[PDB]
Amino acid sequence: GMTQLALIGLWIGFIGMVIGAVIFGQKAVAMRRKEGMEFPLKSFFIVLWAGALYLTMILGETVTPVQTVFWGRYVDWVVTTPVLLLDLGVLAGLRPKLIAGVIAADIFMILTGLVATLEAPPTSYLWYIISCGAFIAILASLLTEFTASAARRNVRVNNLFLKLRNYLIVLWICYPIVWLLGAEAFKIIPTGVEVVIYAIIDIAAKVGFGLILTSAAPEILAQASN
Amino acid sequence: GMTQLALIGLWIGFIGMVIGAVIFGQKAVAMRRKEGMEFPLKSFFIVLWAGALYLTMILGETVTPVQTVFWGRYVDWVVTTPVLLLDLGVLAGLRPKLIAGVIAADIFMILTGLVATLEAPPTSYLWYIISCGAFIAILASLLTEFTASAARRNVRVNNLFLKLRNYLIVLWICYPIVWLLGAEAFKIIPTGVEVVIYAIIDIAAKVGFGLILTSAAPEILAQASN
Amino acid sequence: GMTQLALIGLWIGFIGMVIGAVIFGQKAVAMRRKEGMEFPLKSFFIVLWAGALYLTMILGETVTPVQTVFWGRYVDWVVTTPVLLLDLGVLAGLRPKLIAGVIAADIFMILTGLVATLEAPPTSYLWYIISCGAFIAILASLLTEFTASAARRNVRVNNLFLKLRNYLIVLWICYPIVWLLGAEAFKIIPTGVEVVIYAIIDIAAKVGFGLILTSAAPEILAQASN
Ligand SMILES: *C/C=C(C)/C=C/C=C(C)/C=C/C1=C(C)CCCC1(C)C
Ligand SMILES: *C/C=C(C)/C=C/C=C(C)/C=C/C1=C(C)CCCC1(C)C
Ligand SMILES: *C/C=C(C)/C=C/C=C(C)/C=C/C1=C(C)CCCC1(C)C
Ligand SMILES: CCCCCCCCCCCCCCCC
Ligand SMILES: CCCCCCCCCCCCCCCC
Ligand SMILES: CCCCCCCCCCCCCCCC
Ligand SMILES: CCCCCCCCCCCCCCCC
Ligand SMILES: CCCCCCCCCCCCCCCC
Ligand SMILES: CCCCCCCCCCCCCCCC
Ligand SMILES: CCCCCCCCCCCCCCCC
Ligand SMILES: CCCCCCCCCCCCCCCC
Ligand SMILES: CCCCCCCCCCCCCCCC
Ligand SMILES: CCCCCCCCCCCCCC
Ligand SMILES: CCCCCCCCCCCCCC
Ligand SMILES: CCCCCCCCCCCCCC
Ligand SMILES: CCCCCCCCCCCC
Ligand SMILES: CCCCCCCCCCCC
Ligand SMILES: CCCCCCCCCCCC
Ligand SMILES: CCCCCCCCCCCC
Ligand SMILES: CCCCCCCCCCCC
Ligand SMILES: CCCCCCCCCCCC
Ligand SMILES: CCCCCCCCCC
Ligand SMILES: CCCCCCCCCC
Ligand SMILES: CCCCCCCCCC
Ligand SMILES: CCCCCCCCCC
Ligand SMILES: CCCCCCCC
Ligand SMILES: CCCCCCCC
Ligand SMILES: CCCCCCCC
Ligand SMILES: CCCCCCCC
Ligand SMILES: CCCCCCCC
Ligand SMILES: CCCCCCCC
Ligand SMILES: CCCCCCCC
Ligand SMILES: CCCCCCCC
Ligand SMILES: CCCCCCCC
Ligand SMILES: CCCCCCCC
Ligand SMILES: CCCCCCCC
Ligand SMILES: CCCCCCCC
Ligand SMILES: CCCCCCCC
Ligand SMILES: CCCCCCCC
Ligand SMILES: CCCCCCCC
Ligand SMILES: CCCCCCCC
Ligand SMILES: CCCCCCCC
Ligand SMILES: CCCCCCCC
Ligand SMILES: CCCCCCCC
Ligand SMILES: CCCCCC
Ligand SMILES: CCCCCC
Ligand SMILES: CCCCCC
Ligand SMILES: CCCCCC
Ligand SMILES: CCCCCC
Ligand SMILES: CCCCCC
Ligand SMILES: CCCCCC
Ligand SMILES: CCCCCC
Ligand SMILES: CCCCCC
Ligand SMILES: CCCCCC
Ligand SMILES: CCCCCC
Ligand SMILES: CCCCCC
Ligand SMILES: CCCCCC
Ligand SMILES: CCCCCC
Ligand SMILES: CCCCCC
Ligand SMILES: CCCCCC
Ligand SMILES: CCCCCC
Ligand SMILES: CCCCCC
Ligand SMILES: CCCCCC
Ligand SMILES: CCCCCC
Ligand SMILES: [Mg+2]
Ligand SMILES: [Mg+2]
Ligand SMILES: [Mg+2]
């Protein structure tokens, strides 16, 4: 029931995650019995879950015609975006309870975005604004407590945190902008194009992010983990 | 599909949680880099989640005609009641493995209560009794191992624990009593009145509890958090 | 909607879990002030959750006629199989981050198995293969990382781990074999017989496992817990 372009977009996301899974799985094998192996392993789980959920959408299991609702992508994001933040929190050396609070905010952001996607205007816009409020709090925490914590660590660990922090922030800001421009609000981006855009940003946000992270020198990953 | 009285009750709950969010949000900001900030932060998250779920019920998103089933309140409780017990566990100095067991019992209590609410008599009463059994186990834990652990701490931390322990017990006992008197069992309390009562108890159990906790002297919260 | 044999199988599983919960619950209460009490408590929670889900299937709550899908057993397994792996990880002395990774693989195994159960052939077989891939990763970790960590512990703790590791592995391999032979796939085993078989293996994998673990000498459980 979806457009041909939407199906192409789902295939792009799926193949991207599968390639990521091979890359990070191999890196994790290469890092067995080494400090810092948690980083390729987390990257591997992120792309494995995203890849599985892309497959459920290809198969029509987590999409629903009402326009097609691609609700599987929220099942993906509600699991993978916390693990991405966990990555930065470990790099930053952030206290576990603070990491937990940001993960709670993130899950709230994704679930209110799901409600926004399922609703009709203008109620959908209310939930979009609520979810953006949670996003802004997450961005503020990244730019403040994460950054202050990372600045107390070794220079190379701090440098890697800042690179990934900035990469994550730029990519994540793309999502609510695409949402607002797409069929859920202003209807500027056609539904099929929207699926393709999300797949490209997903690949950047998960495979690109993991490539930057896991390509750091092994000594840096070792000291970052402890 | 709900009565006007029920809608009034949902708005009371919603506005109460929003006011609580302002209070605990300001307290969390004020304790930004102080030991004990975890307490206003958890209180903020509790009323944020409860307020969002009250909003989903106002909007008819988590309410289903089957006779109006307010199943959104279980999505609220299954998340917020564990965090309330975590609060008491940190104050008591309780070992995390013991906190985990009581949280598991609490999630079991809420989920069996959801099955009781969705079921028809007499099967609904079976699940009510099972959920009550989990509740009695939680109460016994609060009165025994939580209380013995708190009694090892200094006088002011122990006194704060006991105040919040007693407050929590009295308010939580109200819930299964309202449930038994309302539409799901004896049908003594009309559905609309039941919604109003839950909103008032919810405000007391989340905002009132958080106010007692977050108004303690900051040095006590700092000591309790260690 | 379900056969008489299938209902008999559900009652066998339910009664087995109730028996386990009495045994492990009383053992947990008897160990209330001792090191190692986490083992009977986790065993109690495992059979409590499984028994409750068996009850939901007896009552038709987590069973849907499609020709009958027993989807409640996935709600059971997604919670209990992680706790069983946690048991082995505590006995082995495994690093918590490693336990978290195998638990993630296990949840993925159970959820992809649920998708396989809900799907139609040949798509169901794709998810079965994916789930088997996760299962193989779990078995590999049990036979490598868990085993290496246990061998660095006291001979009595290590001997207990190996006995439970071998017991668990043999029993868990039975599940995907039954699945492929049964009603969710190739229909060699009648549906009613398949329910009875799952009840028997479930009792062995939860009550039998818990009996072996909690019957160890209390000093062995004590040093394993630390
Ligand atoms: C791997 C997937 C990633 C990094 C997805 C990130 C998604 C977001 C940051 C979503 C943001 C949203 C809002 C801030 C408002 C409501 C709409 C959303 C869910 C797209
Ligand atoms: C903020 C919300 C709170 C503190 C809610 C607490 C709810 C309960 C203690 C519910 C208890 C129930 C039983 C013990 C039996 C079954 C019915 C319930 C779920 C109302
Ligand atoms: C107490 C319940 C237990 C120990 C259940 C264990 C279940 C499994 C190991 C399931 C395995 C499966 C596969 C590996 C492939 C797909 C079918 C499953 C879910 C039966
Ligand atoms: C309807 C079938 C459409 C098939 C579309 C093929 C996708 C083309 C591959 C693009 C994968 C990008 C991988 C990026 C790796 C970093
Ligand atoms: C370094 C260890 C970090 C551990 C992070 C714990 C995750 C906390 C997430 C719990 C939040 C539950 C949100 C439920 C829906 C709002
Ligand atoms: C058929 C429409 C094609 C749509 C092209 C979408 C490109 C969107 C890119 C947005 C951000 C790119 C992140 C890449 C960073 C390396
Ligand atoms: C001091 C921090 C304590 C944190 C304990 C978190 C325990 C998490 C609860 C585990 C129980 C899961 C049961 C799920 C049943 C659906
Ligand atoms: C071990 C748990 C004790 C639970 C206390 C039982 C309270 C009585 C509830 C019985 C349900 C009666 C349904 C009312 C029929 C209108
Ligand atoms: C010691 C810390 C954990 C204490 C909580 C134990 C969990 C007890 C749950 C019991 C549920 C029984 C329901 C059946 C009653 C008829
Ligand atoms: C040291 C104990 C002080 C805290 C005591 C709190 C008592 C809570 C009063 C709540 C009033 C609700 C009454 C409902 C009775 C059915
Ligand atoms: C512990 C529960 C306290 C609840 C107090 C509520 C008092 C008002 C309830 C009156 C309901 C009677 C409605 C009359 C119309 C049928
Ligand atoms: C003693 C160590 C306990 C470790 C428990 C951590 C559990 C983390 C589970 C990771 C969640 C992955 C879920 C994927 C699908 C929702
Ligand atoms: C889709 C699942 C991906 C599986 C991970 C692939 C890992 C490849 C291992 C490569 C090891 C090479 C050693 C030199
Ligand atoms: C649609 C009916 C809603 C009326 C309730 C509004 C109450 C007045 C607003 C109070 C503002 C709350 C400040 C935190
Ligand atoms: C109505 C179904 C008959 C009841 C049979 C009872 C099942 C016995 C379970 C065995 C428990 C095993 C504990 C080791
Ligand atoms: C800042 C944006 C808040 C959400 C407003 C959405 C308005 C969409 C207009 C749709 C016209 C087709
Ligand atoms: C028709 C309005 C009914 C008003 C109900 C008042 C509820 C007070 C509950 C107090 C419980 C602590
Ligand atoms: C409309 C209802 C407003 C309730 C706001 C509650 C703030 C104080 C809570 C005290 C709990 C006893
Ligand atoms: C521990 C709970 C007691 C068990 C009650 C089982 C009730 C079975 C009812 C079957 C009727 C369809
Ligand atoms: C122990 C951590 C390894 C988890 C690996 C999961 C493997 C999933 C395989 C998917 C089937 C192709
Ligand atoms: C690497 C994944 C291994 C999967 C094992 C295959 C299970 C049997 C497939 C038969 C399905 C019809
Ligand atoms: C929280 C403030 C409530 C203001 C009510 C707005 C009414 C809009 C409904 C059309
Ligand atoms: C009222 C709930 C059941 C109470 C059992 C525990 C009482 C022990 C008091 C120390
Ligand atoms: C941390 C103890 C393990 C409990 C696993 C529960 C998994 C629920 C998945 C839905
Ligand atoms: C009527 C079902 C009886 C099933 C027999 C259970 C015992 C078999 C253990 C191998
Ligand atoms: C770290 C995994 C988070 C999963 C959150 C799921 C909430 C629906
Ligand atoms: C029906 C919900 C109206 C809320 C306004 C939405 C835009 C802020
Ligand atoms: C974590 C803060 C969430 C704020 C949501 C409301 C913003 C309008
Ligand atoms: C985009 C959120 C603004 C937060 C900035 C915090 C101060 C660097
Ligand atoms: C059509 C190919 C898409 C490649 C995505 C690249 C992500 C940075
Ligand atoms: C439409 C009913 C609104 C009720 C407002 C309640 C005041 C807190
Ligand atoms: C229709 C407005 C009635 C609101 C009642 C307010 C009770 C707090
Ligand atoms: C500083 C402690 C933050 C704890 C917040 C967790 C809320 C679930
Ligand atoms: C800081 C005020 C938060 C407002 C609560 C919003 C409830 C969804
Ligand atoms: C800010 C909350 C708006 C709620 C609108 C309710 C419309 C039925
Ligand atoms: C009658 C609708 C039941 C929906 C409840 C689902 C809550 C997880
Ligand atoms: C610690 C709060 C999260 C509990 C959520 C459980 C939902 C089944
Ligand atoms: C002590 C941790 C127990 C958690 C198990 C929860 C299963 C219902
Ligand atoms: C069909 C289930 C009936 C159980 C009723 C038990 C009430 C105590
Ligand atoms: C489309 C029929 C299969 C349904 C599978 C649902 C998986 C979430
Ligand atoms: C259209 C889905 C086909 C899945 C292939 C089955 C692999 C055994
Ligand atoms: C993959 C099967 C290995 C089983 C070996 C365990 C010894 C009983
Ligand atoms: C190699 C020893 C494994 C024996 C366990 C089998 C239990 C059915
Ligand atoms: C080593 C066990 C893998 C599961 C394959 C199931 C056999 C049909
Ligand atoms: C792993 C990609 C499979 C593609 C099938 C056409
Ligand atoms: C491995 C995925 C193949 C599915 C084809 C739709
Ligand atoms: C459109 C139905 C999707 C529900 C997502 C949980
Ligand atoms: C059912 C999910 C509701 C989340 C709103 C915070
Ligand atoms: C769970 C939220 C559903 C909203 C449908 C409009
Ligand atoms: C904090 C509210 C954000 C709204 C911007 C769209
Ligand atoms: C709108 C909420 C923003 C919070 C910033 C700390
Ligand atoms: C089909 C769109 C391809 C865009 C390349 C980044
Ligand atoms: C979602 C079903 C939960 C059952 C609790 C016993
Ligand atoms: C858990 C679902 C219960 C529904 C019974 C009508
Ligand atoms: C209309 C009910 C109001 C209740 C406030 C105590
Ligand atoms: C009607 C407001 C209720 C406040 C909680 C005591
Ligand atoms: C019930 C609210 C109490 C507030 C104490 C500061
Ligand atoms: C007919 C009842 C059989 C029970 C087997 C344990
Ligand atoms: C280090 C692996 C943890 C995986 C988190 C989902
Ligand atoms: C792991 C793929 C399916 C997850 C949603 C049930
Ligand atoms: C299932 C095969 C496991 C391999 C053991 C190293
Ligand atoms: C390896 C487990 C031995 C079997 C115990 C009955
Ligand atoms: C793998 C079993 C196939 C059965 C064909 C009837
Ligand atoms: C009824 C059979 C019990 C199986 C115990 C291993
Ligand atoms: Mg929409
Ligand atoms: Mg009901
Ligand atoms: Mg099937």
Cα gap B37→B27, rounded to integer Å: 8
Please answer yes or no on whether A61 and C119 come within 8 Å at the CB atom. yes
Side chain identity, residue A59:
L
Contacts of C170-175 spanning 24+ positions with Cβ under 8 A = C171/C201, C171/C204, C171/C205, C171/C208, C171/C209, C172/C135, C172/C139, C172/C205, C174/C201, C175/C201
Per-residue H/E/C for chain C: CCCHHHHHHHHHHHHHHHHHHHHHHHHHHHCCCCCCCHHHHHHHHHHHHHHHHHHHHHCCCCCEECCEECCHHHHHHHHHHHHHHHHHHHHHCCCHHHHHHHHHHHHHHHHHHHHHHHCCCCHHHHHHHHHHHHHHHHHHHHHHHHHHHHHCCCHHHHHHHHHHHHHHHHHHHHHHHHHHHCCCCCCCCCHHHHHHHHHHHHHHHHHHHHHHHHHCCHHHHHHHHC
Task: From A10, A39, A11, select the one nearest A25 (Cα to Cα).
Answer: A39
Q: Do B61 and A115 touch (CB under 8 A)?
A: yes
Q: Calculate Rg over the CA atoms of chain C.
A: 18
Residue nearest atom 6 of ligand 20, based on CA coordinates: C134
| CA Rg value for chain B | 18
Cα distance between residue B167 and residue B213, in whole Å: 11
Reported resolution, Å? 1.9
Q: Could you give the C-alpha distances from B125 to B35, B68, B105, B172, B180, in angstroms and in order?
A: 45, 18, 19, 19, 9
Spacing of C-alpha A109 from chain mean position = 12
SS3 A175: helix
- Ligand-binding site membership of A38 (annotated): no
**Lookup: tokens for A160:** 């890697």
Indicate the residue of A45, A48, A56 with minimum beta-carbon distance to C115.
Answer: A56
What chain B residue is nearest to C41 in terms of C-alpha separation?
Answer: B101
Give how far B78 is from chain C: nearest CA, Å: 16
Which of these, B163, B28, B141, lies nearest to B94 by C-alpha position? B141
Atom of ligand 14 nearest to the CA of B15: 12
Q: What is the residue with the minimal CA distance to atom 4 of ligand 31?
A: B8
Nearest to C172 by CA among C143, C138, C148, C196: C138
Q: Which amino acid is at B95?
A: R
Specify the residue with its C-alpha closest to ligand 50, atom 2: A133
Q: Is the CB of C55 under 6 A from ligand 53?
A: no
Helix (H) or strand (E) holding A50: helix A38-58
Instruction: Please provide residue B78's backbone torsions phi and psi, each rounded to the nearest 5 degrees.
Output: -65, -20
Tell me if B216 sits within 8 A of B56, measured CB to CB. Answer: no
For B65, the 3-state DSSP assignment is strand
Which residues on chain B are in Cβ contact (under 8 Å) with C38? 97
Method: X-ray
C35 marked among binding-site residues: no
Contact A52 C130 (CB under 8 A): yes
What HEC string does C5-18 produce?
Answer: HHHHHHHHHHHHHH
Which residues precede a break in chain C, with C-to-N distance above 2.5 Å? Answer: 66
